[PDB]
Amino acid sequence: AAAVIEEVEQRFSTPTALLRGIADAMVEEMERGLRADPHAPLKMLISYVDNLPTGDEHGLFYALDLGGTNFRVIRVQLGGREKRVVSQQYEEVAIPPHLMVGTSMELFDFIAAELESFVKTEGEDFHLPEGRQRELGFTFSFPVHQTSISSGTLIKWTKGFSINGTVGEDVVAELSRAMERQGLDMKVTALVNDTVGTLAGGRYVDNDVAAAVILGTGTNAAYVEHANAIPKWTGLLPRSGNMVINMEWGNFKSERLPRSDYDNALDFESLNPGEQIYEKMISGMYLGEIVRRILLKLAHDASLFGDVVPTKLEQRFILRTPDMSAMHHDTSHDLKHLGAKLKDILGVADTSLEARYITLHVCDLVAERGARLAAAGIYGILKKLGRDRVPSDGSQKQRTVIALDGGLYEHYKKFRTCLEATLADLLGEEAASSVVVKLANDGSGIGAALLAASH
Numbered sequence: 001a002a003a004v005i006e007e008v009e010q011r012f013s014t015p016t017a018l019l020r021g022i023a024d025a026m027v028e029e030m031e032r033g034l035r036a037d038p039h040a041p042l043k044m045l046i047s048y049v050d051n052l053p054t055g056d057e058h059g060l061f062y063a064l065d066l067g068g069t070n071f072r073v074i075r076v077q078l079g080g081r082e083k084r085v086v087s088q089q090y091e092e093v094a095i096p097p098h099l100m101v102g103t104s105m106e107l108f109d110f111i112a113a114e115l116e117s118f119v120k121t122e123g124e125d126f127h128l129p130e131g132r133q134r135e136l137g138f139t140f141s142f143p144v145h146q147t148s149i150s151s152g153t154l155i156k157w158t159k160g161f162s163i164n165g166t167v168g169e170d171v172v173a174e175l176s177r178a179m180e181r182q183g184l185d186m187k188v189t190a191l192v193n194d195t196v197g198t199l200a201g202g203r204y205v206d207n208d209v210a211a212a213v214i215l216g217t218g219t220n221a222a223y224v225e226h227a228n229a230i231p232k233w234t235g236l237l238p239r240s241g242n243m244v245i246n247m248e249w250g251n252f253k254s255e256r257l258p259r260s261d262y263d264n265a266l267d268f269e270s271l272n273p274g275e276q277i278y279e280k281m282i283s284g285m286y287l288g289e290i291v292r293r294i295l296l297k298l299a300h301d302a303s304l305f306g307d308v309v310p311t312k313l314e315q316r317f318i319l320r321t322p323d324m325s326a327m328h329h330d331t332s333h334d335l336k337h338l339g340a341k342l343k344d345i346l347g348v349a350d351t352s353l354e355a356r357y358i359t360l361h362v363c364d365l366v367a368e369r370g371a372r373l374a375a376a377g378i379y380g381i382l383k384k385l386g387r388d389r390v391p392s393d394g395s396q397k398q399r400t401v402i403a404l405d406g407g408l409y410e411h412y413k414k415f416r417t418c419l420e421a422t423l424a425d426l427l428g429e430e431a432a433s434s435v436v437v438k439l440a441n442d443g444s445g446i447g448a449a450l451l452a453a454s455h
Contacts, residue, residue, distance in 0.1 A: 001302075002302060004297060004298060004301070004302055005358065005361065005362075008260070008294055008362070008365060009365060011258060011259075011260040011261075012258060012260065012365045012366070012368075012369040013258070013369075014258060014368075014369055014372040014373060014376075014422075016425055016426065018256065018258065019372060019373070019375070019376040019379070019422070019426055020376075020379075020426065021256045022254060022256045022257065022373065022376040022377075022380070023376045023377070023379040023380035023383060023426065024380070024383075025254040025256055025380075026249070026252060026254075026376070026377050026380030026381070026383075027380045027383045027384050029041060029042045029252060029254075030042060030044060030247070030380070030381075030384050031384075033247070034225070034229075034230045034231065034232060034245070035231055035232055036232050041251045041252060041253055042247055042248060042249055042251065042252055043246075043247075043248045043251075044230075044245050044246075044247050044248070045146060045193075045245065045246040045247075045248060046146060046230065046232075046233055046243060046245065046246075047146060047192070047193070047196045047222070047243070047244045047245065047246050048146055048148055048149040048243075049149065049190070049192070049196055049200065049243070049244040049450065050227070050241050050242055050243050050244070051453055051454065052199070052200055052203040052204070052224075052244070052450075052453060053200055053201075053203055053204035053449045053450060053452060053453040054204070054207075054453070055080075055081050055084060055204055055205070055207075056080055056081045057078045057080070057204075057449070057452035057453065058078055058079060058080050058452075059077075059078055059127045059128070059452065060075065060076075060077055060078075060125055060126060060127035060134065061075070061076055061078065061134075061135060061136070061137070061448045061449070061451045061452045062074065062075050062115075062119070062134055062135065062136035062137070062186065062448060062451070063075075063076075063136055063137045063138075063139065063445060063446060063447035063448035063451060064111070064115060064136055064137075064138050064139065064175075065139040065141075065194075065444045065445055065447060066111065066138075066139065066140050066141060066142075067139070067141040067194070067444060068141065068159050068160060069094060069095055069100070069160060070092055070093065070094045070095065071092070071093055071095065071111060071114075072090055072091070072092045072093075072444075072445060073090060073091055073092075073093070073114070073115050073118045074088070074090040074442075074445045074446065074447060074448050075088065075089060075090070075118075075122075075125055075448070076088040076446065076448050076449070077123075077124070077125050077126065078449075078452055084204075084205075087123060087124055087125055089123075089125070090445065091118050093114045095107070095110070095111075096110070100160055100161050100162075100163070101161075101162050101163065102163065102164070103163065103164050103165050104163050104164065104165020104166045104174060105165065105177075105178060105181075107163060108174050108175055108177075108178035109178050109181060109182070111175070111178065112175060112178040112179040112181070112182045112184060113182045115136075115179070115182075115184065115186075116179065116182045116183075116184040116186075119134070119184060119186070133185055133186065133187050134185065134186045134187070135186070135187045135188070135189045135451050135454075135455065136186055136187070136188055136189070136448070136451060137188075137189060137190045137191075137192060137197070137446075137447045137448050137449075137450050137451035138150075138171075138172060138175060138188050138190065138191050138192065139192050139193070139194055139197050139443075139444045139445070139447050140152075140171055140191060140192075140193075141159075141193070141194055141444070142154060142155075142156075142157060142158055142159070142161070142171075143155035143156055143158065144171065144191070144193075146191070147170070149189075149190055149191070149454060150172055150188055150189050150190050150191050150454070151170050151172050151173070151191060152170060152171060152172065152191050153167075153168050153169060153170055153171070154166045154167045154168065154169065154171050155167075171191070172188050172191050175188060176188060189451050189454045189455060190450050190451055190454050192447060192450060193220075193222070193246045194214065194220070194443050194444035195212055195213075195214055195220040195221060195222040195246055195247075195443065196212075196222045196244055196246055196443075196450070197443040197444055197445070197446060197447040197450055198212040198214060198222070198403055198405045198440050198443025198444075199211065199212035199222045199223070199224070199244060199403055199440075199443075200244075200443075200446070200447075200449055200450035200453065201403070201440050201441070201442065201443055201445075201446040201447070201449050201450075202401065202403025202438065202440035203403075204446075204449040204453075205440070206401050206403075206438060208398060208399045208400055208401040208436075209401040209402070209403045209438070209440070210223055210224045210385060210387070210400050210401065210402070211223035211224065211378070211381050211382075211385075211402050211403070212402070212403040212404070212405065212440060212443065213374070213377075213378060213402060213403075213404050213405070213406075213409075214404075214405045214406040214443070215282065215283065215284070215374060215404065215405075215406040215408040215409045215415075215419075216283065216284055216405065216406030216407045216408055216409075217283060217284055217285050217406075217407075218250055218276075218279055218283050218285060219249070219250050219278070219279050219282045219283040219374070219406075220246070220247065220248060220249060220250055221247045221249045221377065221378075221381060222244055222245060222246050222247060223244070223245055223247070223381050223384075223385070224242050224243070224244055224245075224385075225242060225243055225244070225245045225384075225385075226242060226385075227239040227240060227241050227242055227243050228240055230243055230245065247381075249278065249377060250276045250278055250279030250283070251275055251276050251277070251278070251279070252277070252278040252377070253274075253277040253278060257277065257278065257281060257373070258369065258373075259277075259281070262290055262293040262294060262297075263280065263281060263290070265293060266280055266286060266289055266290065266293065267280060269316070278373070278377070281369065281370060281373055282370040282373055282374050282377075283370075283408065284321040284406070284407060284408045285321070286321075287321040287324060287366055287367060287370055287408075288319040288320050288321040288322075288323060288324035289316065289317060289319065290366045291319060291324050291362050291363050291366045292313070292318065292319040294362050294366070295313065295319075295359065295362060296313060296314060298358070299313055299314075300314075304355050304358065304359075305348055305351060305352075305355050310346055310348050311346055311347070311348070312346055313346045313348070318345060318346075319345055320345075321408065321412075322407075322411070323341065323345050324363050324366075324367075325363075325367075325411065325412045325414075325415075326341055327341050327342075327359065327360065327363055328360065328363040328364065328367060328412075328414055329413065329414065330360065334353065334356075335353065335356040335357060335360060338356050338359065338360055339351045339356045342356075342359065364414075367412065367414060367415050367418065368418055370408075370415065371414075371415045371416070371418035371419040371422060372418065372419070372422045374419055375419045375420070375422035375423035375426060376422075376426065378402055378419075378423055378437075379423055379426040379427065381402075382400065382402075382427065382435065385400075387400045387431075387434070387435065388426075388427055388431060389431060390430045390431050390434065395433075395434055396434050399434050399435070399436065400434060400435045400436070401435075401436045401437075401438050402435065402436070402437050402438065403438055403439075403440030404416075404437055404438065404439055404440060405439070405440050405441060405442075405443050409439070410439065410441075419437070420437050423435070423437065
């Protein structure tokens with residue numbers, strides 16, 4: 001006894017042919033979210049961003065990022081095409097728990113007051129003297145019905161917030177009135193989702209950015225779509241420009257996604273069980289939880305470490321994805337950090353080489369399945385734009401950049417390498433040379449570049 005791995009080694013396996021089927025399903029759900037719907041799991045929301053930053057922007061621009069327990073306030077100083085971002089700084093403020101459960105004016109008074117506190121600590125930072133009006137880009141990480149570039153009504157509070165207020169009302173107006181009470185003179189020129197602001201930041205740096213992907217806590221993707229047509233917005237009457245689409249692709253589901261019982265079990269116990277399926281297979285919030293469950297089966301019906309049912313190994317969330325990445329990367333001949341990381345997060349006395357390497361093999365598949373499935377989505381978006389094949393001739397002069405972000409891409413080397421090598425096999429040798437995957441570092445933060453782009 002026994003090899004319980006081989007079942008795993010195949011319920012997770014993503015051969016290129018399956019990756020091709022999943023991308024077509026993604027392309028197919030993207031056409032459904034743009035129609036729409038009627039039940040499309042990809043909301044494929046219009047962002048009302050049809051003009052992206054170019055690089056020739058000048059002046060001071062601010063940004064607010066309300067993402068959860070913490071919010072960040074950003075100011076950058078732009079200096080044109082030559083110097084580009086010539087200055088930038090930012091503070092980060094944690095929301096008191098009494099404010100995330102209070103009233104609406106209470107939270108936004110605190111937010112707006114903290115911002116203006118930060119507004120009058122400038123440099124070095126400067127805009128046309130004086131008594132010009134500052135303009136800020138607002139990244140608001142809650143569900144919103146977008147009604148314009150700089151407006152949108154809250155659908156429902158989430159992620160730790162039960163506030164009496166907002167919710168049907170324009171969250172941008174909510175911020176404006178709060179700022180006046182502090183009393184700040186600032187115009188909110190754009191209301192963005194963290195993924196849209198990632199694409200905008202990437203575009204400002206490289207003109208060929210057409211999409212952006214976050215592989216962090218969660219997963220999402222935005223991309224530039226031909227206006228005529230997104231038929232629910234045109235092409236009757238036509239527009240003839242483009243329009244950035246916030247996909248909300250974490251809720252993508254397909255019977256082709258290679259799930260297993262650990263995924264269904266993680267779903268059975270999740271706080272939204274059948275929603276965000278693709279997300280629970282790719283994102284960081286779950287990769288370690290998956291390698292945790294695969295280790296338990298080896299810890300309760302296998303077994304992995306001797307004749308004992310390890311301790312806190314039976315707890316949810318106990319093995320974080322950063323903790324799983326540290327193990328995966330152990331290149332010692334004996335796997336000592338891998339082994340002397342098992343001893344910490346669980347712990348577990350004397351893990352052996354067969355127990356250490358099998359664990360190295362477990363992380364080797366959970367991460368491989370996520371990175372390969374994420375390259376199938378990226379491949380699906382590329383298809384949607386017709387950038388997955390080459391033309392008669394030009395090699396597609398307008399090359400395609402995909403701006404990536406998120407701690408998973410940015411801090412899990414075997415994930416990013418696996419992702420960019422899988423996308424290259426999906427695209428061919430020809431078309432691969434025409435598609436670049438590029439790190440685009442702070443999206444929810446800039447944000448501000450998208451602010452410069454709109455007056």
